[PDB]
From a paper:
The ATP-dependent chromatin remodeling complex BAF, also known as mammalian SWI/SNF complex, is a multi-subunit remodeler and is crucial for regulating gene expression and developmental programming. Here, we depict the structures of both human SS18/BRG1 and yeast SNF11/SNF2 subcomplexes. Both subcomplexes assemble into heterodimers that share a similar conformation, suggesting that SNF11 might be a homologue of SS18 in chromatin remodeling complexes. Importantly, our study shows that the self-association of the intrinsically disordered region, QPGY domain, leads to liquid-liquid phase separation (LLPS) of SS18 or SS18-SSX and the subsequent recruitment of BRG1 into phase-separated condensates.
We succeeded in obtaining crystals of the single polypeptide created by the fusion of BRG1(172–213) to the N-terminus of SS18(14–101) with a tobacco etch virus (TEV)-cleavable segment. The crystal structure of BRG1(172-213)-SS18(14-101) was determined at a resolution of 2.39 Å with four copies of the complex molecule in one asymmetric unit. In the final model, BRG1(172-213) was resolved from aa 172 to 207, including the QLQ domain. SS18(14-101) was well-resolved from aa 14 to 79, including the SNH domain. The overall structure of BRG1(172-213)-SS18(14-101) resembles a four-helix bundle, which span residues 174–190 (αA), 198–205 (αB) in BRG1(172-213) and residues 19–39 (α1), 44–74 (α2) in SS18(14-101). The interaction between BRG1(172-213) and SS18(14-101) was maintained through hydrogen-bonding and hydrophobic interactions. The hydrophobic amino acids (I32, L54, and A65) on SS18 and the amino acids at the corresponding positions of BRG1 form three groups of hydrophobic cores. Residues A65, L54, and I32 were mutated to glutamic acid in SS18 or SS18-SSX1, herein referred to as SS18(3M) and SS18(3M)-SSX1, respectively. As anticipated, co-immunoprecipitation (co-IP) analyses showed that the 3M mutations in SS18 or SS18-SSX1 can largely disrupt the binding of SS18 (lane 3 compared to lane 2 in Fig. 1f) or SS18-SSX1 (lane 4 compared to lane 2 in Supplementary Fig. 4a) to BRG1. Remarkably, either the double (Q176A, Q183A) or the single mutations (Q183A) almost completely abolished the binding of BRG1 to SS18.
Residue numbers in the entry:
A (entry chain C), B (entry chain B): 2 to 38, 50 to 121
C (entry chain A): 1 to 39, 49 to 121
D (entry chain D): 2 to 38, 54 to 121
């Protein structure tokens, strides 16, 4: 259960990840989208603030990847990228499971 | 990142998940281990307390999954299952990255 | 599986020792003993490695670490390289087996 | 250091591994080749024990394939692979010619 801003921020971080793994710099349009524009439930289900907390993490991870890159700091760059990647897999998984619409349909009548 | 109590609790929850997914009940020793015994970092790396928050989330998801198998509510016994599965993949991925030993070795001499 | 906690500790220490021995350093006395560890059934029916097989190769690695050190003092350059190559290949093997055994993502089935 | 029997059994086990990763069967000629006939370095008996282990894993993998046990098949495959990588690294190190040569004069 993402909100629109969160889905837009997530997809922006997934694109930022791909460019950073290809050494590329980030367009300022993308840099800002990466940054964007109660915390724990009773069941254990994730909450909107939990989602925003992880997306804010990702934004900071991205700042760290670029700083490590631009200083040639290599192994630290990869530990950040692997943390980012694991977060994005997690958020992408939750986003798809809740937004998916085929699985709401029964068999043909 | 992970301490040993947490690694142990994660493993028990993974094992609990597999039994619950194949409709079994949980042994007493596993029902105990899945319970065990701020939150944000400046760089975005997950923190011990974030890890423990999700492990507690998972224990409450496991309690709800066990109930909906005695409450007959088949449908939400699977949204809980899918939330627990995605959490376990995430924690397992972080735990495997930290504990990995082959990455600590250089290339051949 | 087959790794116990003492072996995982001995294997980390040997990996640490390996690098120090590759960057010319000597090993502190603490680490020289962490590499020995503390203190039959060597083959299994299926071929899976056994605890005793792991322990024998960790002990071999300790002897290799000792041959490496001694031959670094005596500058035996060509001795040192063959020992280092054997140690490296053992540590990669033990590290791969330890990782596979401890790996927790592979324990999880497909999404529901 | 390997002997020629071991090198031949190792190459056959490397071949057998690839075919099994493709669900294919093993010609009897390969199956038989896969079976064969203080300082810390590896010894020839240690080499043979691991080649013997690999034959036993291959039997377990084939049996786990035929009987459809997929999770078990891949755990043996992972163990056989790690053994093969290890024996191959050692055999390649001992036999490698180019690393013996200095830089151009």
């Amino acid at each position: 259960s993402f909100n629109q801003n969160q889905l837009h921020q997530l997809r922006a971080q997934i694109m930022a990840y791909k460019m950073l793994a290809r050494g590329q710099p980030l367009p300022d349009h993308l840099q800002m989208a990466v940054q964007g524009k109660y915390f724990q439930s009773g069941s254990g289900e994730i909450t909107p603030a939990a989602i925003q907390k992880m997306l804010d993490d990702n934004n900071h991870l991205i700042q760290c990847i670029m700083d490590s890159q631009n200083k040639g700091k290599t192994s630290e760059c990869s530990q950040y990228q692997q943390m980012l990647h694991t977060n994005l897999v997690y958020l992408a998984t939750i986003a798809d499971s809740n937004q998916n619409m085929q699985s709401l349909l029964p068999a043909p009548p």
